[PDB]
UniProtKB/Swiss-Prot annotation:
GO terms for cellular component: basolateral plasma membrane; cytoplasm; extracellular space. It comes from Bos taurus. The modification Phosphoserine is found at S198. This is Lactoperoxidase. GO terms for molecular function: calcium ion binding; heme binding; lactoperoxidase activity; peroxidase activity; thiocyanate peroxidase activity. The chain holds residues 118 to 712 of 712 of the full protein. Glycans are attached at N95, N205, N241, N332.
Length: 595
């Protein structure tokens, strides 16, 4: 008797099962469970939820109440003692470009979004959470430990609001609290197109017969498109420079302006759409706008899928790739394609790959102008640096020629994120993404590190000597034991990222298992996977497989010098060629004659 049937929320489907196009919502993908993988549904649970009261309260909520016999250490204290570091010298990944970091964020944003409880608006008790550091309801503040330098400048806590959850807005109660995924679980470019029909419509240029996405009307990048601004206020990008007064961008995903490189990437994807559509009109003057919109959408979705599985995943999972993701054997509708709640924390390995600076580069890949190199913290929610300071090309060059940060057991997350994160609402480049992640694991009722090792068939250390061996690191194991007292309590974000990386990859065994399993399911449980015969033709697939990130850049920027292997580290000029040496997407196979 599955207590399945909470809650009402989103209108529960309307299918043309036989349409060759995805819905915007993800409904109608699976024929027998038509809501599977759709936006605005509960994140999947691969293990039962672990909550202080067994139902919804996070571990850490009640001071005297222990997890497995021990107090859960403060998320900020773990961030300060384990995750932090001062010295930015020597931290970079010698064989991953900064595009490696950024593509990972793009992928994450296509697959998952668990937004915060919205209640705080129309009310100040929300502003009171921050003002007075008071725990209650969806207020779950991150308290500072003693000796925290932020006590001298910033008060006693960093406010934190709990993630939204299904049966959604009333607090309690029935089965364990299940957080929501607000985007489609399929790898479908929902971050470009939107996951809800409201937004999908707004993003489109409905005035045009070419099936284009709306572009900025106030500014251009040497005649190429920007994303449109959001006309609603206060978007925080206005607040960060009140002289420039440049709003955030409007995109398929509301996080698109969070940081400037993400917005950059969003912009290349939007241009590519409009490129594809125009090109498809030239080839098929008889197609209407809807047809044009949908066919371009379908190709861009293929693009995202192909780059991710062919170029990105093999260099994340390295030698574990083949073990969790065998060669594709066709669509299987018995597979659950939903993103799991645990994945939303496993994929935050990306946070350990973000460097402390971003560069703008000129055409000789030299520092562009006197302010060429910028600290990452000044870029959160920053659109003015694109629109008033050179467009996206100098930033895209930096993506190609600069490097991702390497995850290092002694230098985990840069201070730009760990001390200077900007959150839109109460004035300050002062939050801690690591602390947030840890607190969020607890918020989400995450099982601990040993439960996940068990799930993956991996050994479960119970002692310091055991942990030293799994981590291959004596100091890091001792520091974790001092805070957590048992490896059973280590929060999954920090335990999975603490493990030494597998050969040719950039995550450890535990993460390789959790990431690999999720990506297999999203390929296998998707009716519209690009390789599923009949979604495209053989000739279309032959053409799609010539696509690369280098070509995306060549086609939609004024950059002409590019590497062949965009994700590896590439030193200019030796690893660079010009755009005339890089294969093009041959659109001939989409010429249709309706004679
Ligand atoms: C995965 C992933 C998440 C969780 C997505 C989900 O909601 O299910 C994620 C989250 C965040 C958040 C929200 C934090 C919280 O309230 O719990 C912020 C503010 C943030 C900021 C930035 N991140 Fe991130 N992040 C995920 C994945 C990745 C990856 C993966 C490869 C990278 C890289 C990345 C980078 C950044 C980033 C860079 C400048 C900022 C800022 N994130 N993330
Ligand atoms: C806020 O944004 C403005 C607008 O871009 C920045 O000023 C520009 O930068 C340089 C020199 O300051 C010039 O090339 C532009 O013409 C400037 N415009 C104006 C109006 O000054 C300004 O630097 C930004 N300030 C901060 C603190 O972010
Ligand atoms: C960089 O990584 C790729 C895998 O992407 C590998 O094939 C290549 O040999 C690596 N380069 C070096 C110098 O190790
Ligand atoms: C929509 O396309 C039309 C015709 O191609 C163009 O004139 C207009 O600027 C576009 N509008 C938006 C908002 O992008
Ligand atoms: C489809 O997946 C389910 C669950 O993983 C499995 O029982 C079934 O054997 C799979 N089908 C094929 C052809 O592998
Ligand atoms: Ca999606």
């Amino acid at each position: 008797s599955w207590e399945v049937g909470c809650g009402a929320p989103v209108p529960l489907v309307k299918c043309d099962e036989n349409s060759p196009y995805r819905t915007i919502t993800g409904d109608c993908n699976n024929r027998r469970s038509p809501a599977l993988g759709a936006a605005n549904r509960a994140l999947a649970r691969w293990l039962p939820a672990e909550y202080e009261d067994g139902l919804a309260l996070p571990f850490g909520w009640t001071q005297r109440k222990t997890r497995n016999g021990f107090r859960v250490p403060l998320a900020r204290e773990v961030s300060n003692k384990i995750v932090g570091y001062l010295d930015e010298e020597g931290v970079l990944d010698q064989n991953r470009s900064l595009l490696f970091m950024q593509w990972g964020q793009i992928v994450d944003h296509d697959l998952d979004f668990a937004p915060e409880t919205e209640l705080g608006s129309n009310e100040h008790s929300k502003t009171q959470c921050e003002e007075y550091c008071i725990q209650g309801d969806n207020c779950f503040p991150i308290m500072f430990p003693k000796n925290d330098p932020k006590l001298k400048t910033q008060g006693k806590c960093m406010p934190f609001f709990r993630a939204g959850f299904v049966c959604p807005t009333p607090p309690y109660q029935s089965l364990a609290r299940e957080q929501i995924n607000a985007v489609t679980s399929f790898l479908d470019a929902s971050l470009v197109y939107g996951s809800e029909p409201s937004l999908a419509s707004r993003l489109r240029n409905l005035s045009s017969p070419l099936g284009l996405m709306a572009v900025n009307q106030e500014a251009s990048d040497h005649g190429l498109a920007y994303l449109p601004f959001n006309n609603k206020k206060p978007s925080p990008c206005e607040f960060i420079n009140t002289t420039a007064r440049v709003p955030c961008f409007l995109a398929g995903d509301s996080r698109a302006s969070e940081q400037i490189l993400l917005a950059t990437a969003h912009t290349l994807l939007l241009r590519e759409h409009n490129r594809l559509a125009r090109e498809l009109k030239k080839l098929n003057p008889h197609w209407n706008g809807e047809k044009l919109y949908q066919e371009a959408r379908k190709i861009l979705g293929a693009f995202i899928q192909i780059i991710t599985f062919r170029d990105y995943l093999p260099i994340v999972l390295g030698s574990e790739m083949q073990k969790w993701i065998p060669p594709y054997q066709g669509y299987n509708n018995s597979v659950d394609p939903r993103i799991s709640n645990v994945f939303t924390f496993a994929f935050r390995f990306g946070h350990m790959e973000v460097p402390s600076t971003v560069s703008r580069l000129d055409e000789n890949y030299q520092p562009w102008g006197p302010e060429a190199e910028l600290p990452l913290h000044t870029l959160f929610f920053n659109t003015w640096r694109i629109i008033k300071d050179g467009g996206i090309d100098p930033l895209v060059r930096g993506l190609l020629a600069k490097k991702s940060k390497l995850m290092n057991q002694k230098k985990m997350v840069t201070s730009e994120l760990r001390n200077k994160l900007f959150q839109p609402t109460h004035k300050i480049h002062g939050f801690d993404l690591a602390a947030i992640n840890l607190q969020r694991c607890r918020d989400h009722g995450m099982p601990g590190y040993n439960s996940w090792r068990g799930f993956c068939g991996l050994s479960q250390p119970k002692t310091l000597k055991g942990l030293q061996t799994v981590l291959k690191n004596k100091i890091l194991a001792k520091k974790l034991m001092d805070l957590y007292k048992t490896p059973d309590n280590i929060d999954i974000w920090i335990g999975g990222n603490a493990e030494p990386m597998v050969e040719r990859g950039r995550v450890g065994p535990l993460l390789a298992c959790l990431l690999g399993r999720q990506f297999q399911q999203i390929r296998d449980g998707d009716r519209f996977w690009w390789e599923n015969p009949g979604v495209f033709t053989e000739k279309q697939r032959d053409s799609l497989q010539k696509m690369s990130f280098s070509r995306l850049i060549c086609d939609n920027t004024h950059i002409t010098k590019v590497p062949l292997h965009a994700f590896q580290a590439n030193n200019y000029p030796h690893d660079f060629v010009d755009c005339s040496t890089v294969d093009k997407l041959d659109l001939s196979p989409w010429a249709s004659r309706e004679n």
